[PDB]
Amino acid sequence: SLHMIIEVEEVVGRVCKAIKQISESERKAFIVELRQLSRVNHPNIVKLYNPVCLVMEYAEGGSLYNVLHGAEPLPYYTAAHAMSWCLQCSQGVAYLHSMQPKALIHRDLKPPNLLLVAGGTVLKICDGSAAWMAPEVFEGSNYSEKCDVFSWGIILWEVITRRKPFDEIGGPAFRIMWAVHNGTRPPLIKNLPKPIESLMTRCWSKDPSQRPSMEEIVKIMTHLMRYFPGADEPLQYPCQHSLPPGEDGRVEPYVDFAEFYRLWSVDHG
Ligand SMILES: */C=C/C(=O)Nc1ccccc1Oc1nc(Nc2cnn(C)c2)ncc1Cl
Incomplete structure:
Protein backbone atom coordinates (compact mmCIF):
# COMPACT_ATOMS: atom_id res chain seq x y z
CA SER A 1 0.00 0.00 0.00
CA LEU A 2 0.98 3.67 -0.33
CA HIS A 3 -0.52 6.72 1.37
CA MET A 4 -1.36 9.86 -0.60
CA ILE A 5 -0.88 13.48 0.46
CA ILE A 6 1.99 20.43 3.34
CA GLU A 7 3.97 23.47 4.52
CA VAL A 8 7.43 23.63 2.94
CA GLU A 9 10.01 24.79 5.49
CA GLU A 10 13.71 25.67 5.27
CA VAL A 11 16.04 23.40 3.31
CA VAL A 12 18.19 20.94 5.26
CA GLY A 13 20.59 19.27 2.85
CA ARG A 14 21.33 17.89 -0.59
CA VAL A 15 15.48 17.59 0.34
CA CYS A 16 13.85 20.11 2.68
CA LYS A 17 12.00 20.20 6.00
CA ALA A 18 10.57 14.88 5.27
CA ILE A 19 9.94 15.72 1.60
CA LYS A 20 12.77 15.09 -0.88
CA GLN A 21 12.12 16.04 -4.52
CA ILE A 22 12.63 14.92 -8.11
CA SER A 23 16.07 17.10 -12.33
CA GLU A 24 13.35 15.26 -14.26
CA SER A 25 16.15 12.84 -15.23
CA GLU A 26 15.84 11.14 -11.82
CA ARG A 27 12.16 10.36 -12.51
CA LYS A 28 13.21 6.81 -13.44
CA ALA A 29 15.52 6.29 -10.46
CA PHE A 30 12.55 7.62 -8.48
CA ILE A 31 10.18 4.85 -9.60
CA VAL A 32 12.65 2.09 -8.73
CA GLU A 33 13.11 3.55 -5.25
CA LEU A 34 9.45 4.18 -4.41
CA ARG A 35 8.23 0.69 -5.38
CA GLN A 36 10.57 -0.92 -2.84
CA LEU A 37 9.93 1.67 -0.12
CA SER A 38 6.18 0.98 -0.10
CA ARG A 39 6.80 -2.73 0.50
CA VAL A 40 9.16 -2.07 3.44
CA ASN A 41 7.76 -1.40 6.92
CA HIS A 42 9.96 -1.68 10.00
CA PRO A 43 10.62 0.38 13.16
CA ASN A 44 14.32 0.83 12.34
CA ILE A 45 13.60 2.07 8.79
CA VAL A 46 12.43 5.54 7.80
CA LYS A 47 8.65 5.89 7.79
CA LEU A 48 7.09 7.01 4.51
CA TYR A 49 3.80 8.87 4.93
CA ASN A 50 1.92 16.22 -8.00
CA PRO A 51 4.71 16.87 -8.77
CA VAL A 52 6.38 13.54 -7.99
CA CYS A 53 7.73 13.63 -4.44
CA LEU A 54 7.81 11.75 -1.13
CA VAL A 55 6.86 12.50 2.47
CA MET A 56 9.14 10.82 5.02
CA GLU A 57 9.25 11.45 8.76
CA TYR A 58 11.49 14.35 9.77
CA ALA A 59 14.21 12.99 12.05
CA GLU A 60 15.20 16.06 14.07
C1 LIG B 1 18.17 8.99 5.13
C2 LIG B 1 19.37 9.57 4.39
C3 LIG B 1 19.60 11.02 4.80
O1 LIG B 1 20.01 11.27 5.88
N1 LIG B 1 19.32 12.09 3.86
C4 LIG B 1 19.54 13.47 4.26
C5 LIG B 1 20.80 14.04 4.15
C6 LIG B 1 21.00 15.35 4.53
C7 LIG B 1 19.94 16.09 5.04
C8 LIG B 1 18.68 15.52 5.15
C9 LIG B 1 18.48 14.20 4.78
O2 LIG B 1 17.21 13.59 4.87
C10 LIG B 1 16.61 13.57 6.15
N2 LIG B 1 17.02 14.35 7.14
C11 LIG B 1 16.43 14.31 8.32
N3 LIG B 1 16.88 15.17 9.41
C12 LIG B 1 17.95 16.15 9.26
C13 LIG B 1 18.07 17.33 10.00
N4 LIG B 1 19.18 17.95 9.58
N5 LIG B 1 19.74 17.18 8.60
C14 LIG B 1 20.96 17.50 7.88
C15 LIG B 1 19.02 16.10 8.40
N6 LIG B 1 15.42 13.49 8.56
C16 LIG B 1 14.96 12.69 7.62
C17 LIG B 1 15.54 12.70 6.36
CL1 LIG B 1 14.95 11.62 5.07
Missing part, protein backbone atom coordinates in the same frame (compact mmCIF):
# COMPACT_ATOMS: atom_id res chain seq x y z
CA GLY A 61 18.43 14.45 15.28
CA GLY A 62 19.87 14.16 11.78
CA SER A 63 22.39 11.60 10.62
CA LEU A 64 24.50 9.42 12.88
CA TYR A 65 27.49 10.86 11.02
CA ASN A 66 26.50 14.36 12.12
CA VAL A 67 26.16 13.21 15.73
CA LEU A 68 29.53 11.43 15.76
CA HIS A 69 31.67 13.84 13.74
CA GLY A 70 29.51 16.85 12.88
CA ALA A 71 29.53 20.49 13.95
CA GLU A 72 30.26 21.29 17.58
CA PRO A 73 28.92 21.15 20.18
CA LEU A 74 28.75 17.37 19.89
CA PRO A 75 26.63 15.36 22.34
CA TYR A 76 27.97 12.86 24.83
CA TYR A 77 27.15 9.17 24.45
CA THR A 78 28.01 5.89 26.15
CA ALA A 79 28.92 2.35 25.20
CA ALA A 80 25.23 1.50 25.61
CA HIS A 81 24.23 3.99 22.91
CA ALA A 82 26.98 2.81 20.56
CA MET A 83 25.94 -0.83 20.94
CA SER A 84 22.24 0.04 20.77
CA TRP A 85 22.80 1.99 17.55
CA CYS A 86 24.57 -0.96 15.94
CA LEU A 87 21.91 -3.37 17.22
CA GLN A 88 19.01 -1.38 15.78
CA CYS A 89 20.95 -1.05 12.52
CA SER A 90 21.38 -4.81 12.15
CA GLN A 91 17.70 -5.27 13.00
CA GLY A 92 16.62 -3.08 10.09
CA VAL A 93 19.12 -4.61 7.66
CA ALA A 94 18.02 -8.11 8.68
CA TYR A 95 14.45 -7.12 7.79
CA LEU A 96 15.65 -6.22 4.29
CA HIS A 97 17.63 -9.45 3.93
CA SER A 98 14.66 -11.50 5.20
CA MET A 99 12.39 -10.21 2.44
CA GLN A 100 10.35 -12.18 -0.09
CA PRO A 101 10.56 -13.00 -2.89
CA LYS A 102 14.08 -11.59 -3.34
CA ALA A 103 16.29 -10.40 -0.48
CA LEU A 104 16.69 -6.63 -0.71
CA ILE A 105 20.29 -5.45 -0.25
CA HIS A 106 21.08 -1.97 1.05
CA ARG A 107 24.51 -1.76 -0.64
CA ASP A 108 25.49 1.65 0.75
CA LEU A 109 25.36 1.26 4.54
CA LYS A 110 27.07 4.14 6.32
CA PRO A 111 26.36 6.58 9.18
CA PRO A 112 25.34 9.36 6.75
CA ASN A 113 22.32 7.19 5.83
CA LEU A 114 21.43 6.32 9.45
CA LEU A 115 19.04 8.78 11.07
CA LEU A 116 18.38 9.21 14.79
CA VAL A 117 15.15 10.13 16.58
CA ALA A 118 13.75 10.17 20.12
CA GLY A 119 16.69 12.03 21.61
CA GLY A 120 19.30 10.14 19.61
CA THR A 121 18.18 6.77 21.01
CA VAL A 122 16.20 5.24 18.12
CA LEU A 123 18.16 4.63 14.92
CA LYS A 124 16.49 4.31 11.52
CA ILE A 125 17.90 3.28 8.14
CA CYS A 126 17.40 5.58 5.15
CA ASP A 127 17.88 4.16 1.65
CA GLY A 128 32.93 8.99 -0.42
CA SER A 129 31.57 5.59 0.59
CA ALA A 130 34.89 3.76 0.07
CA ALA A 131 35.58 3.57 3.81
CA TRP A 132 32.51 1.39 4.46
CA MET A 133 32.53 -0.55 1.17
CA ALA A 134 33.37 -4.25 1.08
CA PRO A 135 36.36 -5.22 -1.10
CA GLU A 136 34.36 -7.54 -3.38
CA VAL A 137 31.98 -4.68 -4.24
CA PHE A 138 34.28 -2.07 -5.77
CA GLU A 139 36.39 -4.72 -7.53
CA GLY A 140 33.35 -5.63 -9.66
CA SER A 141 32.31 -9.05 -8.35
CA ASN A 142 28.92 -10.68 -7.81
CA TYR A 143 28.38 -9.12 -4.40
CA SER A 144 25.57 -10.15 -2.06
CA GLU A 145 23.93 -9.28 1.26
CA LYS A 146 27.23 -10.09 3.00
CA CYS A 147 28.53 -6.71 1.81
CA ASP A 148 26.20 -5.00 4.29
CA VAL A 149 27.85 -7.08 7.04
CA PHE A 150 31.23 -5.60 6.11
CA SER A 151 29.78 -2.09 6.37
CA TRP A 152 28.24 -2.89 9.76
CA GLY A 153 31.64 -4.07 11.00
CA ILE A 154 33.18 -0.72 10.06
CA ILE A 155 30.30 1.17 11.69
CA LEU A 156 30.82 -0.83 14.89
CA TRP A 157 34.46 0.27 14.98
CA GLU A 158 33.35 3.84 14.22
CA VAL A 159 30.87 4.36 17.07
CA ILE A 160 33.18 2.76 19.66
CA THR A 161 36.20 4.89 18.72
CA ARG A 162 34.25 7.90 17.41
CA ARG A 163 36.83 8.11 14.61
CA LYS A 164 36.26 8.54 10.89
CA PRO A 165 37.39 5.20 9.39
CA PHE A 166 40.46 5.50 7.17
CA ASP A 167 40.93 9.19 7.90
CA GLU A 168 44.66 8.55 8.34
CA ILE A 169 44.83 7.41 4.71
CA GLY A 170 42.64 10.15 3.25
CA GLY A 171 43.17 11.18 -0.34
CA PRO A 172 40.77 10.24 -3.14
CA ALA A 173 38.51 7.19 -2.99
CA PHE A 174 40.80 4.86 -4.96
CA ARG A 175 43.50 5.14 -2.27
CA ILE A 176 41.12 3.72 0.35
CA MET A 177 39.90 1.05 -2.07
CA TRP A 178 43.51 0.02 -2.72
CA ALA A 179 44.14 -0.30 1.02
CA VAL A 180 40.98 -2.28 1.85
CA HIS A 181 41.56 -4.53 -1.16
CA ASN A 182 45.07 -5.39 0.07
CA GLY A 183 43.76 -6.28 3.55
CA THR A 184 44.12 -3.07 5.58
CA ARG A 185 41.43 -2.69 8.24
CA PRO A 186 40.84 -0.09 10.95
CA PRO A 187 43.24 -0.41 13.88
CA LEU A 188 42.27 -2.60 16.81
CA ILE A 189 40.75 -0.98 19.89
CA LYS A 190 42.47 -0.81 23.28
CA ASN A 191 40.87 -2.93 26.00
CA LEU A 192 38.05 -4.02 23.69
CA PRO A 193 36.02 -7.02 24.93
CA LYS A 194 36.98 -10.22 23.15
CA PRO A 195 33.35 -11.03 22.18
CA ILE A 196 32.98 -7.63 20.51
CA GLU A 197 36.45 -7.82 18.94
CA SER A 198 35.63 -11.28 17.55
CA LEU A 199 32.34 -10.18 15.99
CA MET A 200 33.97 -7.08 14.50
CA THR A 201 36.89 -8.89 12.85
CA ARG A 202 34.62 -11.63 11.50
CA CYS A 203 32.31 -9.00 9.99
CA TRP A 204 35.13 -7.56 7.86
CA SER A 205 36.85 -10.75 6.75
CA LYS A 206 38.24 -10.85 3.22
CA ASP A 207 36.19 -13.95 2.38
CA PRO A 208 32.49 -12.95 2.40
CA SER A 209 31.42 -16.49 3.35
CA GLN A 210 33.34 -16.25 6.64
CA ARG A 211 31.33 -13.19 7.69
CA PRO A 212 28.28 -13.81 9.90
CA SER A 213 24.73 -13.29 8.74
CA MET A 214 22.68 -10.32 9.91
CA GLU A 215 20.36 -12.69 11.79
CA GLU A 216 23.42 -13.92 13.69
CA ILE A 217 24.58 -10.33 14.30
CA VAL A 218 21.16 -9.32 15.64
CA LYS A 219 20.98 -12.31 17.98
CA ILE A 220 24.52 -11.75 19.30
CA MET A 221 24.00 -8.01 19.76
CA THR A 222 20.66 -8.62 21.49
CA HIS A 223 22.31 -10.86 24.09
CA LEU A 224 25.12 -8.34 24.62
CA MET A 225 22.72 -5.50 25.49
CA ARG A 226 22.17 -7.32 28.79
CA TYR A 227 25.59 -5.92 29.72
CA PHE A 228 24.94 -2.45 28.24
CA PRO A 229 22.10 -0.82 30.18
CA GLY A 230 21.11 2.79 29.66
CA ALA A 231 20.36 2.90 25.92
CA ASP A 232 17.01 4.65 26.51
CA GLU A 233 18.63 7.75 28.01
CA PRO A 234 18.38 10.72 25.61
CA LEU A 235 21.53 12.52 24.53
CA GLN A 236 21.77 15.89 26.29
CA TYR A 237 25.20 16.39 27.79
CA PRO A 238 27.96 18.33 25.99
CA CYS A 239 31.32 16.90 25.00
CA GLN A 240 34.53 18.90 24.71
CA HIS A 241 36.45 16.92 22.14
CA SER A 242 40.13 16.08 21.79
CA LEU A 243 41.33 13.00 19.92
CA PRO A 244 44.80 11.47 20.40
CA PRO A 245 46.35 9.93 17.26
CA GLY A 246 46.81 6.21 17.82
CA GLU A 247 50.44 5.21 17.36
CA ASP A 248 51.53 1.59 16.94
CA GLY A 249 48.34 0.51 15.16
CA ARG A 250 46.14 0.75 18.25
CA VAL A 251 43.55 3.36 19.24
CA GLU A 252 41.75 4.21 22.46
CA PRO A 253 37.95 3.84 22.58
CA TYR A 254 35.69 6.81 23.12
CA VAL A 255 33.07 4.83 25.04
CA ASP A 256 33.92 3.16 28.35
CA PHE A 257 33.53 -0.59 28.85
CA ALA A 258 34.14 -0.49 32.62
CA GLU A 259 30.46 -1.16 33.32
CA PHE A 260 30.51 -4.03 30.81
CA TYR A 261 33.35 -5.95 32.47
CA ARG A 262 31.65 -5.28 35.81
CA LEU A 263 28.32 -6.78 34.76
CA TRP A 264 30.15 -9.57 32.91
CA SER A 265 31.99 -10.53 36.10
CA VAL A 266 28.72 -10.90 38.02
CA ASP A 267 27.35 -13.54 35.63
CA HIS A 268 30.63 -15.36 34.91
CA GLY A 269 33.28 -14.41 37.48
Whole structure:
Protein backbone atom coordinates (compact mmCIF):
# COMPACT_ATOMS: atom_id res chain seq x y z
CA SER A 1 0.00 0.00 0.00
CA LEU A 2 0.98 3.67 -0.33
CA HIS A 3 -0.52 6.72 1.37
CA MET A 4 -1.36 9.86 -0.60
CA ILE A 5 -0.88 13.48 0.46
CA ILE A 6 1.99 20.43 3.34
CA GLU A 7 3.97 23.47 4.52
CA VAL A 8 7.43 23.63 2.94
CA GLU A 9 10.01 24.79 5.49
CA GLU A 10 13.71 25.67 5.27
CA VAL A 11 16.04 23.40 3.31
CA VAL A 12 18.19 20.94 5.26
CA GLY A 13 20.59 19.27 2.85
CA ARG A 14 21.33 17.89 -0.59
CA VAL A 15 15.48 17.59 0.34
CA CYS A 16 13.85 20.11 2.68
CA LYS A 17 12.00 20.20 6.00
CA ALA A 18 10.57 14.88 5.27
CA ILE A 19 9.94 15.72 1.60
CA LYS A 20 12.77 15.09 -0.88
CA GLN A 21 12.12 16.04 -4.52
CA ILE A 22 12.63 14.92 -8.11
CA SER A 23 16.07 17.10 -12.33
CA GLU A 24 13.35 15.26 -14.26
CA SER A 25 16.15 12.84 -15.23
CA GLU A 26 15.84 11.14 -11.82
CA ARG A 27 12.16 10.36 -12.51
CA LYS A 28 13.21 6.81 -13.44
CA ALA A 29 15.52 6.29 -10.46
CA PHE A 30 12.55 7.62 -8.48
CA ILE A 31 10.18 4.85 -9.60
CA VAL A 32 12.65 2.09 -8.73
CA GLU A 33 13.11 3.55 -5.25
CA LEU A 34 9.45 4.18 -4.41
CA ARG A 35 8.23 0.69 -5.38
CA GLN A 36 10.57 -0.92 -2.84
CA LEU A 37 9.93 1.67 -0.12
CA SER A 38 6.18 0.98 -0.10
CA ARG A 39 6.80 -2.73 0.50
CA VAL A 40 9.16 -2.07 3.44
CA ASN A 41 7.76 -1.40 6.92
CA HIS A 42 9.96 -1.68 10.00
CA PRO A 43 10.62 0.38 13.16
CA ASN A 44 14.32 0.83 12.34
CA ILE A 45 13.60 2.07 8.79
CA VAL A 46 12.43 5.54 7.80
CA LYS A 47 8.65 5.89 7.79
CA LEU A 48 7.09 7.01 4.51
CA TYR A 49 3.80 8.87 4.93
CA ASN A 50 1.92 16.22 -8.00
CA PRO A 51 4.71 16.87 -8.77
CA VAL A 52 6.38 13.54 -7.99
CA CYS A 53 7.73 13.63 -4.44
CA LEU A 54 7.81 11.75 -1.13
CA VAL A 55 6.86 12.50 2.47
CA MET A 56 9.14 10.82 5.02
CA GLU A 57 9.25 11.45 8.76
CA TYR A 58 11.49 14.35 9.77
CA ALA A 59 14.21 12.99 12.05
CA GLU A 60 15.20 16.06 14.07
CA GLY A 61 18.43 14.45 15.28
CA GLY A 62 19.87 14.16 11.78
CA SER A 63 22.39 11.60 10.62
CA LEU A 64 24.50 9.42 12.88
CA TYR A 65 27.49 10.86 11.02
CA ASN A 66 26.50 14.36 12.12
CA VAL A 67 26.16 13.21 15.73
CA LEU A 68 29.53 11.43 15.76
CA HIS A 69 31.67 13.84 13.74
CA GLY A 70 29.51 16.85 12.88
CA ALA A 71 29.53 20.49 13.95
CA GLU A 72 30.26 21.29 17.58
CA PRO A 73 28.92 21.15 20.18
CA LEU A 74 28.75 17.37 19.89
CA PRO A 75 26.63 15.36 22.34
CA TYR A 76 27.97 12.86 24.83
CA TYR A 77 27.15 9.17 24.45
CA THR A 78 28.01 5.89 26.15
CA ALA A 79 28.92 2.35 25.20
CA ALA A 80 25.23 1.50 25.61
CA HIS A 81 24.23 3.99 22.91
CA ALA A 82 26.98 2.81 20.56
CA MET A 83 25.94 -0.83 20.94
CA SER A 84 22.24 0.04 20.77
CA TRP A 85 22.80 1.99 17.55
CA CYS A 86 24.57 -0.96 15.94
CA LEU A 87 21.91 -3.37 17.22
CA GLN A 88 19.01 -1.38 15.78
CA CYS A 89 20.95 -1.05 12.52
CA SER A 90 21.38 -4.81 12.15
CA GLN A 91 17.70 -5.27 13.00
CA GLY A 92 16.62 -3.08 10.09
CA VAL A 93 19.12 -4.61 7.66
CA ALA A 94 18.02 -8.11 8.68
CA TYR A 95 14.45 -7.12 7.79
CA LEU A 96 15.65 -6.22 4.29
CA HIS A 97 17.63 -9.45 3.93
CA SER A 98 14.66 -11.50 5.20
CA MET A 99 12.39 -10.21 2.44
CA GLN A 100 10.35 -12.18 -0.09
CA PRO A 101 10.56 -13.00 -2.89
CA LYS A 102 14.08 -11.59 -3.34
CA ALA A 103 16.29 -10.40 -0.48
CA LEU A 104 16.69 -6.63 -0.71
CA ILE A 105 20.29 -5.45 -0.25
CA HIS A 106 21.08 -1.97 1.05
CA ARG A 107 24.51 -1.76 -0.64
CA ASP A 108 25.49 1.65 0.75
CA LEU A 109 25.36 1.26 4.54
CA LYS A 110 27.07 4.14 6.32
CA PRO A 111 26.36 6.58 9.18
CA PRO A 112 25.34 9.36 6.75
CA ASN A 113 22.32 7.19 5.83
CA LEU A 114 21.43 6.32 9.45
CA LEU A 115 19.04 8.78 11.07
CA LEU A 116 18.38 9.21 14.79
CA VAL A 117 15.15 10.13 16.58
CA ALA A 118 13.75 10.17 20.12
CA GLY A 119 16.69 12.03 21.61
CA GLY A 120 19.30 10.14 19.61
CA THR A 121 18.18 6.77 21.01
CA VAL A 122 16.20 5.24 18.12
CA LEU A 123 18.16 4.63 14.92
CA LYS A 124 16.49 4.31 11.52
CA ILE A 125 17.90 3.28 8.14
CA CYS A 126 17.40 5.58 5.15
CA ASP A 127 17.88 4.16 1.65
CA GLY A 128 32.93 8.99 -0.42
CA SER A 129 31.57 5.59 0.59
CA ALA A 130 34.89 3.76 0.07
CA ALA A 131 35.58 3.57 3.81
CA TRP A 132 32.51 1.39 4.46
CA MET A 133 32.53 -0.55 1.17
CA ALA A 134 33.37 -4.25 1.08
CA PRO A 135 36.36 -5.22 -1.10
CA GLU A 136 34.36 -7.54 -3.38
CA VAL A 137 31.98 -4.68 -4.24
CA PHE A 138 34.28 -2.07 -5.77
CA GLU A 139 36.39 -4.72 -7.53
CA GLY A 140 33.35 -5.63 -9.66
CA SER A 141 32.31 -9.05 -8.35
CA ASN A 142 28.92 -10.68 -7.81
CA TYR A 143 28.38 -9.12 -4.40
CA SER A 144 25.57 -10.15 -2.06
CA GLU A 145 23.93 -9.28 1.26
CA LYS A 146 27.23 -10.09 3.00
CA CYS A 147 28.53 -6.71 1.81
CA ASP A 148 26.20 -5.00 4.29
CA VAL A 149 27.85 -7.08 7.04
CA PHE A 150 31.23 -5.60 6.11
CA SER A 151 29.78 -2.09 6.37
CA TRP A 152 28.24 -2.89 9.76
CA GLY A 153 31.64 -4.07 11.00
CA ILE A 154 33.18 -0.72 10.06
CA ILE A 155 30.30 1.17 11.69
CA LEU A 156 30.82 -0.83 14.89
CA TRP A 157 34.46 0.27 14.98
CA GLU A 158 33.35 3.84 14.22
CA VAL A 159 30.87 4.36 17.07
CA ILE A 160 33.18 2.76 19.66
CA THR A 161 36.20 4.89 18.72
CA ARG A 162 34.25 7.90 17.41
CA ARG A 163 36.83 8.11 14.61
CA LYS A 164 36.26 8.54 10.89
CA PRO A 165 37.39 5.20 9.39
CA PHE A 166 40.46 5.50 7.17
CA ASP A 167 40.93 9.19 7.90
CA GLU A 168 44.66 8.55 8.34
CA ILE A 169 44.83 7.41 4.71
CA GLY A 170 42.64 10.15 3.25
CA GLY A 171 43.17 11.18 -0.34
CA PRO A 172 40.77 10.24 -3.14
CA ALA A 173 38.51 7.19 -2.99
CA PHE A 174 40.80 4.86 -4.96
CA ARG A 175 43.50 5.14 -2.27
CA ILE A 176 41.12 3.72 0.35
CA MET A 177 39.90 1.05 -2.07
CA TRP A 178 43.51 0.02 -2.72
CA ALA A 179 44.14 -0.30 1.02
CA VAL A 180 40.98 -2.28 1.85
CA HIS A 181 41.56 -4.53 -1.16
CA ASN A 182 45.07 -5.39 0.07
CA GLY A 183 43.76 -6.28 3.55
CA THR A 184 44.12 -3.07 5.58
CA ARG A 185 41.43 -2.69 8.24
CA PRO A 186 40.84 -0.09 10.95
CA PRO A 187 43.24 -0.41 13.88
CA LEU A 188 42.27 -2.60 16.81
CA ILE A 189 40.75 -0.98 19.89
CA LYS A 190 42.47 -0.81 23.28
CA ASN A 191 40.87 -2.93 26.00
CA LEU A 192 38.05 -4.02 23.69
CA PRO A 193 36.02 -7.02 24.93
CA LYS A 194 36.98 -10.22 23.15
CA PRO A 195 33.35 -11.03 22.18
CA ILE A 196 32.98 -7.63 20.51
CA GLU A 197 36.45 -7.82 18.94
CA SER A 198 35.63 -11.28 17.55
CA LEU A 199 32.34 -10.18 15.99
CA MET A 200 33.97 -7.08 14.50
CA THR A 201 36.89 -8.89 12.85
CA ARG A 202 34.62 -11.63 11.50
CA CYS A 203 32.31 -9.00 9.99
CA TRP A 204 35.13 -7.56 7.86
CA SER A 205 36.85 -10.75 6.75
CA LYS A 206 38.24 -10.85 3.22
CA ASP A 207 36.19 -13.95 2.38
CA PRO A 208 32.49 -12.95 2.40
CA SER A 209 31.42 -16.49 3.35
CA GLN A 210 33.34 -16.25 6.64
CA ARG A 211 31.33 -13.19 7.69
CA PRO A 212 28.28 -13.81 9.90
CA SER A 213 24.73 -13.29 8.74
CA MET A 214 22.68 -10.32 9.91
CA GLU A 215 20.36 -12.69 11.79
CA GLU A 216 23.42 -13.92 13.69
CA ILE A 217 24.58 -10.33 14.30
CA VAL A 218 21.16 -9.32 15.64
CA LYS A 219 20.98 -12.31 17.98
CA ILE A 220 24.52 -11.75 19.30
CA MET A 221 24.00 -8.01 19.76
CA THR A 222 20.66 -8.62 21.49
CA HIS A 223 22.31 -10.86 24.09
CA LEU A 224 25.12 -8.34 24.62
CA MET A 225 22.72 -5.50 25.49
CA ARG A 226 22.17 -7.32 28.79
CA TYR A 227 25.59 -5.92 29.72
CA PHE A 228 24.94 -2.45 28.24
CA PRO A 229 22.10 -0.82 30.18
CA GLY A 230 21.11 2.79 29.66
CA ALA A 231 20.36 2.90 25.92
CA ASP A 232 17.01 4.65 26.51
CA GLU A 233 18.63 7.75 28.01
CA PRO A 234 18.38 10.72 25.61
CA LEU A 235 21.53 12.52 24.53
CA GLN A 236 21.77 15.89 26.29
CA TYR A 237 25.20 16.39 27.79
CA PRO A 238 27.96 18.33 25.99
CA CYS A 239 31.32 16.90 25.00
CA GLN A 240 34.53 18.90 24.71
CA HIS A 241 36.45 16.92 22.14
CA SER A 242 40.13 16.08 21.79
CA LEU A 243 41.33 13.00 19.92
CA PRO A 244 44.80 11.47 20.40
CA PRO A 245 46.35 9.93 17.26
CA GLY A 246 46.81 6.21 17.82
CA GLU A 247 50.44 5.21 17.36
CA ASP A 248 51.53 1.59 16.94
CA GLY A 249 48.34 0.51 15.16
CA ARG A 250 46.14 0.75 18.25
CA VAL A 251 43.55 3.36 19.24
CA GLU A 252 41.75 4.21 22.46
CA PRO A 253 37.95 3.84 22.58
CA TYR A 254 35.69 6.81 23.12
CA VAL A 255 33.07 4.83 25.04
CA ASP A 256 33.92 3.16 28.35
CA PHE A 257 33.53 -0.59 28.85
CA ALA A 258 34.14 -0.49 32.62
CA GLU A 259 30.46 -1.16 33.32
CA PHE A 260 30.51 -4.03 30.81
CA TYR A 261 33.35 -5.95 32.47
CA ARG A 262 31.65 -5.28 35.81
CA LEU A 263 28.32 -6.78 34.76
CA TRP A 264 30.15 -9.57 32.91
CA SER A 265 31.99 -10.53 36.10
CA VAL A 266 28.72 -10.90 38.02
CA ASP A 267 27.35 -13.54 35.63
CA HIS A 268 30.63 -15.36 34.91
CA GLY A 269 33.28 -14.41 37.48
C1 LIG B 1 18.17 8.99 5.13
C2 LIG B 1 19.37 9.57 4.39
C3 LIG B 1 19.60 11.02 4.80
O1 LIG B 1 20.01 11.27 5.88
N1 LIG B 1 19.32 12.09 3.86
C4 LIG B 1 19.54 13.47 4.26
C5 LIG B 1 20.80 14.04 4.15
C6 LIG B 1 21.00 15.35 4.53
C7 LIG B 1 19.94 16.09 5.04
C8 LIG B 1 18.68 15.52 5.15
C9 LIG B 1 18.48 14.20 4.78
O2 LIG B 1 17.21 13.59 4.87
C10 LIG B 1 16.61 13.57 6.15
N2 LIG B 1 17.02 14.35 7.14
C11 LIG B 1 16.43 14.31 8.32
N3 LIG B 1 16.88 15.17 9.41
C12 LIG B 1 17.95 16.15 9.26
C13 LIG B 1 18.07 17.33 10.00
N4 LIG B 1 19.18 17.95 9.58
N5 LIG B 1 19.74 17.18 8.60
C14 LIG B 1 20.96 17.50 7.88
C15 LIG B 1 19.02 16.10 8.40
N6 LIG B 1 15.42 13.49 8.56
C16 LIG B 1 14.96 12.69 7.62
C17 LIG B 1 15.54 12.70 6.36
CL1 LIG B 1 14.95 11.62 5.07
